[model samples]
Target chain A: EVQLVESGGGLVQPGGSLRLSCAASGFNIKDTWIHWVRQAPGKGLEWVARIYPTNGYTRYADSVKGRFTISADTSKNTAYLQMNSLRAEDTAVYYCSRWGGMMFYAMDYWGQGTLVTVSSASTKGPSVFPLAPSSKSTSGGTAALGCLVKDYFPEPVTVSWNSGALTSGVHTFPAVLQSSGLYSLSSVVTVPSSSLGTQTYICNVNHKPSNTKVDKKVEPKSC
Target chain B: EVQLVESGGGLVQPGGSLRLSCAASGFNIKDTWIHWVRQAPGKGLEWVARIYPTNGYTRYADSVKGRFTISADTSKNTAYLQMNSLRAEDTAVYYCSRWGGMMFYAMDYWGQGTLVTVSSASTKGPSVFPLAPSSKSTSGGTAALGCLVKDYFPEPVTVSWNSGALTSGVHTFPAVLQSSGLYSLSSVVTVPSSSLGTQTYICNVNHKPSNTKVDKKVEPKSC
Candidate 1:
C-alpha cells in the first residue's frame, strides 16, 4: 500500500554525470522526510530540496546553493538528494518523501521516477550561469539561450546546449504516473542562437551522488 | 553537489490527506526522476506531479484531477508527491523537483519548503473526489474550493488559501517551526457556526500528498 522505488534507466555522456532513485516502502520509515522534485519537457513542476534521513537535516532553496547535497541512510531506511557536476541539465527524475502520517499535510508516499543522462563533460562543472546570447537573429535563424536554475531541486533540471555555439534540441521527458502513487521525470536541452553575446550555458542536476555546474555568467561561490 | 531533502512542519485536519518529501543526495542513484511543487504565502510556483521510481510512473494536472500524486524510490534515491481528497484551498508550500536537466522552463532543484495545515472536519475520506456531500447542511454559504494539479513533473502546481471563511472568527497565525531546518508555516483555524449544520465540510488528499486537509467528509464512492 506504500512504495517509492526508483532507478530503472541510465545514460551519461553529454558532459558526464548521472544518478537517480526514490526508494521507500509500505510506510513508517522512521516517520517521514525525503524529497527531490523536477519535471521538464512540456514544462511544469519544480522544487528540488528536502532530506532528513533521521537527522542528516538540510534545506536549500536560495536556488540550489553550490549545486546540491542532502544525505541519509538510517541503517537502510534510505534518504538522499545529490547533484554535483554533470551536464545535460543533470538529466531528470528523483523522488522520496514522507510527512503526512495521517493528514500531517502533503507528500504521502511516492517514488517511481528515474532517468539520468549527462553524456560526458569530464565530470561536469563549469557553467556557473552563462546565458545571454540572442540579442537578435534572422534569416531562418534560431534563438533560445536559456540557463536558469532559479532554485534547483531533484527533477528534470534543465539548461541545454552541449557542443556550444548555437544551441537548441535535447529534451527528453516522458514518464509520469499519479493517482496518489507519486513519480515524475523530465529532460530538456535546447540552446540555439545566431546572435547576441554572453554565452556559456549549463545547469545540470540529476539530484544524485553529485551533479552540478551552474552558469549564466557565474556568481555564487565564496568559501 | 545535488540535494533535495525535505522533512519538517506539518498539521492537517481540514479534510485529511497528506504526504511530504524530497530526497536525493550527492548525485548518481540511478537515472533521476522526482517532482512535487507548490508555493503559497506570497504565491508563485506550481506543478504537482512526477515520480518514476524505476517503474511506478505517474502524472497529474488537469486541475489536479482527483487531487494529486507523484512517487518514486529507485533502490533508495527518492521522489514522491501525493494529495488525496483534501482541501482548505489546499493550503500551500510543498516542493521536490528534478528533471529539468538543462533548464529552459519548468524546474531545477527546489526543496526545503513544507507547510501543512488543513485543520477540522471530523477527519476522514472527504466526499471522495468532488464526491459531493456526505452529510450536514452541505454546501451552504462561503465556500472557495480549488483543485489543480497538472503534469506533476517539476513545474506548474497551484494551491492558494490564506485563511478560512464560511462564517467563523479569530485567526492570526503564521511562523511556527518546531525543530530541524527550513520552515515557513502559517495557520488560522476557527471552524464555528456552532459546528454548522452538525458540522461537515471536508477535502483531504495525499497526491501521495500535497497541501491542506481540514476534515475529509465528502464521500460516496469517491472519484
Candidate 2:
C-alpha cells in the first residue's frame, strides 16, 4: 500500500534552479531512507543523492554532489531534491525511491518518474483533448475515458479527474516525446456501469511551465 | 558497507525445533526491516517471514504462519527465526535479508545462506585436513592455505582461523552434498608475504551437532 508521487519536473533554462518533490504515503518518511535517481535519454540509470530523514544523513554522487541537494520534510511526509545550475546534461527522468533492502544502496519502491528538460526556449502549455468514452458492457460493465495532454514544453504537468475527487481506477501514463520535440501524456479513468450516462467526468491538466490549466470533460453513454 | 551473517544451521530431527540467527553490521537493525527466506533443494525461493525491529512489526507467509516465528534483538543487532515441527520439506538454505527498497516486500541485503537438514540419523562431525600452503610468489605475493572439512552431517559448521583471532582474508565456501549423504566444506586463508614462513595458522572447525571442535594447522613456507 506504500506509494510515492513525484512532481516538479519541467523545462528549465541553463543555470536555472529547480526543486523536485516526492510525496510519500502509507509509510513514515522519517523512518526510512529516500533516494534520488535519474536516467538521461538513451542512458542508464544514475544515482544522484540519498537522505536518511531520521538522522539527516545524506550522500550525493560525485556527478551531482555539488549541484544536488536531497532532503525530506517529515511533517509533509515528502522528500525533495533541489538542483542548481541546471544544464542540458541534467535533462533526465528524475525518480524518487525508498531504500528497502539490506544492501547499502538498495532502492526498492519507486515513484513514477518526472521528466526534466533543460532548454533555453520559451515554455508551452499542453493541448488538452478528451476522447469519447467507450462502454464495455458487451464484455464487462465499465466505461473507459481517455484524456490526452500533448505538445507540451517543459514536460512536467499534472492531470487530475473531477478536481482530484475521482482517483480510483485512474492511471496516468508517463510522458512520451513527440516528433515535434514536445512531450505528450495520456490518462485514463474507468467509469462503472451504474454511473455510465448519468455522471460527468472532467480531466484537468495543469501545465506548470506556462502556468496554464486546461479542462476537458467526457460523459459516457450507456451501451 | 552493510553485511549480514547467518548462523545456526544444522541437522534437525523431523518434528523437532530449530532456531536460526542473522547478525547484521554497518547498519542498525532497528532502523530497517529484516526478512527470512528459504530455498529447498532444487526448489525456488520462498518467503518465510519478516520483522521490523523498531516497531516489533512482523509478517509471515501463509506457508509458515503457525510454525515459524520471527523476532529481532535490536540491542544485539541480530534477527532470529524460530521454527517448530521441522519436516523434510523444511530442509533448505535459510537466508536473512534486509529490506532495503521502496517496495513492501523488497529484500536488498542478504546473508550467505546456512543449510539445514532434517533427518532421523545421528549427527556426524566433520573431518578437518590441512592442505599444503601453495606459494603464489610468481604471480602474487601471497600464500594460500586450504582447509577441507568433509563428511559431516546436519550441514551447519563454522570455520575460523587461530581461534577466531585471524579473520581477514579468509573465505569459507558453502557446504556441498556428497554422494555418501554427508557434506563437505572448504575454506582458504591468504597469507601475505610478510607473514609467510613466520606464522602458523590453524583452521578451527566447530560442529555444533556433534559438539566437537576440530583443528588443523598449516605452516606456510616462503617461496
Per-prediction DockQ, in order? 0.01, 0.06
How far off is residue B16 in model 1, in Å?
34
- Candidate 2 local Cα displacement, residue B187, angstroms: 6.8
User: How close to the true structure is residue A136 of candidate 1, measured as C-alpha lDDT?
Assistant: 51
Highest TM-score scorer? 2
Highest DockQ against the true fold, candidate: 2
What's model 1's TM-score?
Answer: 0.19
Model 1: per-residue lDDT, tens digit, B68-108? 67766665676556667767666777877665331213456
Which ranges in model 2 have alpha carbons more than 4 Å from their true place?
A: A1-223, B1-7, B23-31, B41-44, B53-57, B72-78, B100-105, B129-150, B157-180, B184-208, B217-223
The reply for model 1, stretches above 4 Å from the true place, is A1-28, A31-94, A97-99, A102-157, A160-223, B1-223
DockQ measured for candidate 1: 0.01
Residues B1-223 of candidate 2 have per-residue lDDT tens digits of 7999999888888999999999999988876779999999879999888887766778998888889899999889999999999888889999999865333356778999988888997798889888657545423667778699999887578999999899998999988989988899999877775676678788889998889798888765435
Model 1 clash count equals 258
Q: Evaluate model 2 with DockQ and give the value.
A: 0.06
Q: After superposition, how far is residue A216 of candidate 2 from its true place, in Å?
A: 43
